[PDB]
């Protein structure tokens, strides 16, 4: 009842994926591709997950189903979404990752990957379909394919083959490893890479990081340690690593759109491809910038279209890299699905060839003064209403203070409000949880906070009137 595709992935409530939904999905998927004729008895699916509670039992779902269906499940154990689908399309495999990605706890989900890439929007359907007209069936486990570390080593090598071993030397960073199914990773690649990485906050309850609206908590804490003067930077991803988190030699977060930029730069990228949400400063720098609407199946529709490289990347912070890069002989082959790994290593790079720190290079780009948040557990009919309430141009003016006009409102995805004063405040429908997004941008810190704070208490007004 919870379970549906949304922005990207199947997700919803654990307790309700972990059981035959999962078992069942995963048919609906192997089943498409086979009756598409692009999976053949006996093909390998490649199954990774992330460490929530559930996921364990739901790749064992996942690949009961797998074998059942008559494919061969290859279990790939605990790594990053990009470190599985990399793997599994280098091998030409479709896969699957069991992953909420930024979601609350008490979810779950998979996310889906063909053998050339994601799935996009037609397959979401197909499989929903399929889905649909599955039998009133055995779900059973796999626990019987060994752990492959194939696919967390490729993907190490990866990286440390292209910058090459030793080649940040120098460098002393943090690695905030709470629940992160990188946090053991990004110790070893940066040793490999002459980095002396220290561990921090390593967590062995799950920690869900949604790195659009970190917590008070995690703020706090790459300050704390961010603080010191010993730290470069302070490192980590989000629960399934397909997000960078980010922070600089003081400890203060730098937003995934800038480190996407700063990854732009770095790779000589001749055109990027961003969703509507981030910075609107990036256009004063990249001359070549498409905008999308919000989610990694729009980044790579577009991204597709494009004839340096065509890079992707979200207010999120994950990468999607869309063609081969070279550097001193050596190359980072196309990966069009977000990753964390790139803007993490790039940002370092930077920090390290132009002996300048990260809060130095951040700066440099002059981003508008951006901040993001959301409201939880708001059912999607309540966001709907709400979303609804500000088309009306009555009622749009009712909730806002009244010296400061709006002068433009856009709803390519979600309602973005735009004012006089140059401020701007974007509400969206999370499409992955229930859940309201509220964006801004002004002119300084005090106003930024201000405005934040009034775009949720809008927002939150208006969801319990209409309660
Ligand atoms: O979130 C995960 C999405 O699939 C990702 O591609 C998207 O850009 C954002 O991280 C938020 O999307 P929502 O705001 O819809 O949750
Ligand atoms: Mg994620």
């Known amino acids: 009842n ?50 929530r509670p559930s996921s364990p039992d739901i790749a064992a779902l996942a690949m009961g189903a797998i074998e059942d269906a008559g494919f061969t499940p290859v279990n790939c154990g605990v790594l990053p979404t990009p470190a599985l689908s990399y793997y599994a399309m280098g091998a030409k495999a479709p896969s699957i990752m069991v992953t909420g990605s930024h979601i609350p706890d008490d979810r779950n989900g998979l996310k889906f990957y063909r053998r050339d890439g994601e799935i996009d929007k037609d397959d979401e359907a197909a499989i929903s379909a399929a889905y649909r007209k599955l039998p ?27 910058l090459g071993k030793g080649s940040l030397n120098g460098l002393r960073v943090g690695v905030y490893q709470h629940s992160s199914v990188a946090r053991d990773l990004l110790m070893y690649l940066l040793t490999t890479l002459g980095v002396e990485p220290v561990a921090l906050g390593r967590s062995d309850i799950f920690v ?20 010191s003067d010993r730290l470069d930077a302070i490192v980590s991803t989000d629960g399934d690593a397909d997000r960078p988190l980010i922070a600089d030699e003081h400890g203060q977060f730098v937003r995934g759109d800038l480190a996407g930029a700063i990854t732009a730069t770095w790779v000589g990228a001749d055109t990027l491809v961003t969703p509507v949400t981030s910075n609107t400063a990036l256009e004063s720098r990249f001359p070549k910038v498409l905008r999308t609407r919000v989610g990694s199946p729009y980044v790579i529709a577009s991204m597709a279209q494009v004839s340096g490289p065509v890079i992707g990347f979200e207010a999120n912070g994950g990468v999607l890299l869309g063609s081969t890069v070279e550097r ?49 557990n708001i059912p999607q009919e309540a966001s ?9 141009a009555d009622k749009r003016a009712s909730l806002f203070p009244a010296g400061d006009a709006i002068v433009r409102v856009e709803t390519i995805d ?54």
């Open 2 to 51: 919870s379970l549906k595709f949304g922005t990207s992935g199947l997700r919803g409530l654990a307790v309700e994926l972990n059981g035959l939904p999962a078992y069942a999905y995963t048919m609906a998927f192997v089943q498409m591709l086979a009756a598409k004729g692009q999976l053949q008895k006996g093909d390998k699916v490649f199954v990774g997950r992330d460490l």
């Open 136 to 162: 009133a069936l055995a779900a059973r486990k796999h626990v019987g394919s060994t752990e492959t570390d194939a696919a967390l080593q490729a993907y190490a090598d990866r990286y440390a083959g292209f």
């Open 208 to 227: 869900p990081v949604d790195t659009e609206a970190l917590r008070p908590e995690d703020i706090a804490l790459l300050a704390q340690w961010g603080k």
């Open 328 to 376: 001193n002989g050596r190359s980072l082959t196309a990966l069009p699905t977000r990753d964390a790994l790139l803007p993490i290593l790039a940002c370092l790079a930077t920090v390290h060839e132009k002996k300048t720190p990260l809060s130095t290079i951040a700066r440099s780009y002059g981003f508008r003064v951006a901040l993001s948040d959301r409201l939880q």
């Open 384 to 392: 709907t209403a709400f979303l609804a309430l500000l088309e009306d």
């Open 414 to 467: 979600g309602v973005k409000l735009f004012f006089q004063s140059g401020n701007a405040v974007h509400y969206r429908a999370s499409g992955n949880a229930p859940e309201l997004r509220c964006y801004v941008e002004s002119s300084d810190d005090t106003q930024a906070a201000k405005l934040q704070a009034l775009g949720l208490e809008i927002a939150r007004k208006a969801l319990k009137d209409a309660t």
